[PDB]
Symmetry: C6
Subunit: 191 residues, 6 copies
Amino acid sequence: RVGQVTGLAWTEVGGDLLTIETACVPGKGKLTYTGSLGEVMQESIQAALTVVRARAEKLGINPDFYEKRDIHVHVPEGATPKDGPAAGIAMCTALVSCLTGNPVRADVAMTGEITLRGQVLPIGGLKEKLLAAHRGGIKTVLIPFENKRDLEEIPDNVIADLDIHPVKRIEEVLTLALQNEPSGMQVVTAK
Amino acid sequence: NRVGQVTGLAWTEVGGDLLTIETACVPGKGKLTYTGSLGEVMQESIQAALTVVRARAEKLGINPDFYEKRDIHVHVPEGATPKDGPAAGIAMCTALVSCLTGNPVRADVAMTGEITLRGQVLPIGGLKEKLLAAHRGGIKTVLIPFENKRDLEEIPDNVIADLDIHPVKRIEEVLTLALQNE
Amino acid sequence: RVGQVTGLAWTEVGGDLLTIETACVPGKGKLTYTGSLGEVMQESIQAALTVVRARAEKLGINPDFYEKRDIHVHVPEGATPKDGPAAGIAMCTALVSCLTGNPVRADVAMTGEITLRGQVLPIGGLKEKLLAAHRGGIKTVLIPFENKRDLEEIPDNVIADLDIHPVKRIEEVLTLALQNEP
Amino acid sequence: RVGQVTGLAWTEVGGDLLTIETACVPGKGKLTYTGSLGEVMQESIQAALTVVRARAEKLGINPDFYEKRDIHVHVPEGATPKDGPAAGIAMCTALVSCLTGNPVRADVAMTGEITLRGQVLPIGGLKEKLLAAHRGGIKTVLIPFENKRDLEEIPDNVIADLDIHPVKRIEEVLTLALQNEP
Amino acid sequence: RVGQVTGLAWTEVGGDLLTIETACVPGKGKLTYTGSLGEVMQESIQAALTVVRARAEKLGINPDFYEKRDIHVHVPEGATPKDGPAAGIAMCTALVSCLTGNPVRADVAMTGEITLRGQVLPIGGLKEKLLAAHRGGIKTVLIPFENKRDLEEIPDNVIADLDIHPVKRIEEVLTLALQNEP
Amino acid sequence: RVGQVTGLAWTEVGGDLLTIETACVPGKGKLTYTGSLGEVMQESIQAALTVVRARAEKLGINPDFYEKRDIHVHVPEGATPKDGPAAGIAMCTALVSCLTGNPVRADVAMTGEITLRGQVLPIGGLKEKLLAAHRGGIKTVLIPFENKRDLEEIPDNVIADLDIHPVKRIEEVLTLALQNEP
């Protein structure tokens, strides 16, 4: 799906999984975000968007086009309170996909705090996040490189059904989550 | 006549029930306003409904730039009744499509369901009380989310007898069923 | 010019007579509303303006008047809290009068909740309102159609002194309350 | 004396007197009101300003002043909370004076609530206001006509050196308060 | 493009020595204020600005400086809550200094509330303020004319060491505080 | 590298090493501050921002940047509350870096309240801030000149390892923090 990403982050009912949605429609450069989102999660969307815009050239988003779009990120179920920083890289991925028409890869989830520099910072509650992904039949989860330590204390039955890809930067997350290569143009070389 | 109207079933502090969702779309400059003693969740459902229409504007027969040329006012009477939740979403989407196209809505049809940006219809809570309101209100046909079908067993036989309940998965089905012309 | 209508609506000390004032001078589209107005009454003014906007051409108003008018709705006494939806039809009438220069009738008061579609919904406290009109020497009162039931309990002399007209729709209100044609 | 008017209105310390000040310099139509003003007094300013706009042509003011002048109302002492509607006719007078160069008259004070139609409505605590006028060497006081009967329960000596003019309409206030025929 | 004055005004610590800063960088008329300022102090900034604007021609400031400058008034220490009207004459001084390039004499501190007419009104806590100027090594202090009596209850040993200039109007403050005659 | 500064400031636990980020992409002047920042810290960003504007020309910065760029200051970790004025010089450094493309030295940490005139004011918690820098591998720390006295009671081993540069003004800060001469 274009603009749809599965994040793992905190909701009232524990650190469940989140179905993030995004729309990029004819407009005037307005950003709106909804889904009973707490302050910290809101700010993660703002950080995620700035990350995209700072990388517009590499990702092929023209500023002309971007200022003629409104963006709405919505996170159903609408009434469920969600919060925290851990959907950061999912917001970013969703927004790149939304702006470029680049479909998100099926059966991937991701968790991690985004920074303006593109670094994926570690999150809390990896146990229950991975539990939620397993429960949902997710096949591949992207997690912060720096949470690799936390995999040890997770039951090996859940670990077995999940393909875990620890990531350090947003460029890697995008290559792992989107169908087409989001950064640059493709050069073929032969030896 | 730039005002769409649709019978919704949604939560109210006087026991969540039958409401008319209204949506006007007069000449303007792309301002959204919403009224009716709405809680935050319901307010956000209006945003989501709008976005569904804006994204599907061509497939729906609406000018894709309609939003620069129109003001949108969504109102949910009765005006003093505190109301909330996502269950009016598909009614808001329908009202807005009606308002912009001139296609009237069937007054004998009511609807309940959370809408997503992807045009899917998600399940709601308190289906009993919703369907009770549709029954008491003399509504003929109710659209409910497909995932609320299992909830239909707890509904009293006489309400199931009275009401033609059509479960829906997508906004497409909603519009086909609720709008008079297409 | 200055639009001026007598409504019956809730104040801190109960339902009472309110002088609703409107000014609509050349401008850029600003809406201001004052009078120690609670949020519900504020929303009723928004609803009333939308009704007018949606009927602009039928009413003979340039449909882009909102681009070139500022509108100030004010409800004295300034210090007295007021609230609820029952001035809706008065607000609409005041707006129409001001924007068309069609003066409001002498000795008419009105109570009733407006909706964007133009249906007039019933209000509470009709007895207190009708008593206030009667004490104030008002000759004609427009009430919502679904308040006909509340007339039984009104003192007989009050019913006899007042000309009471139940209305279903805003068009009826404008025809009865405005001095000229519409 | 231009744009400077003595109002009589409520302050947190009493019904004290108010030195209302105004500035109106070329700009984009900014409106600023300061002086620890409560919501009701702020609302009286908006009412006063709409009355001026509605009458701009008859008062010698260019009606585009809303877009060509920045207006600042300020009521020292800055930290003293002030509120209520009773400075309404003082605000209207201040604004007219500021916008036409017409100085207010020495030793005049005024109290009265303003309506959009220009009627002056009665106020409370008249005795305290007249006392503040007396202690302030005010020789002429404008008051609402409906406060005439309140002059009875005020004593002989706190009035005998005050020239009290009960007024019904804003025109009368402006004629009495300003130096040149408005 | 940064003016600097030492004021004496109320802080959460007490009415102390305070560096009031103002920048006036090229721009399009935005006003920015920071320094943990309470609402009364913010309003004193608005009065100060209006005073400078009303007198721009006299002072040698280009008219329409408010079209072409952004103004930022900051009062360190950033975390210390401050409030009241007493920095008013210091804000005026800083703004005139920023706009004209006329440096402020660092041997001068000042306190006083400013009115739109340029009058200086008396302030509170004179004792604390003059003690903090003395402790701070300030030679000269400007105070409201009406605060003269208050000197009599401040230790004579402190007051003997201060060159105190009681002032009625903003012109007197600008002549005393600005290095070059404005 | 560019638009990235290591600060020492206040934090809900008490550690104090802060990773300050900035971006300044093409836009229309929007300003966004995130990272759970308290109001005093946000004001320090506004102060820092005006410092850059005042000096834009000297720093090679296009003075149009304030309406031509969108500036985002973010301080992870996103969830951790942060406040106080002690990141002011860091915020200024981060902003200058971003707008010039001049990389910040990764071996430098800093702490210091900033003023509109560019002076660096003393902060609190020096002992805890320096211990954070000692533990965290930083080689050079910029501290306000007036905190020199606080080094006396900090343990020798935490300071023996650090190159501590006490600074009075932002110009020093920028020379020592940035890779290429500002």
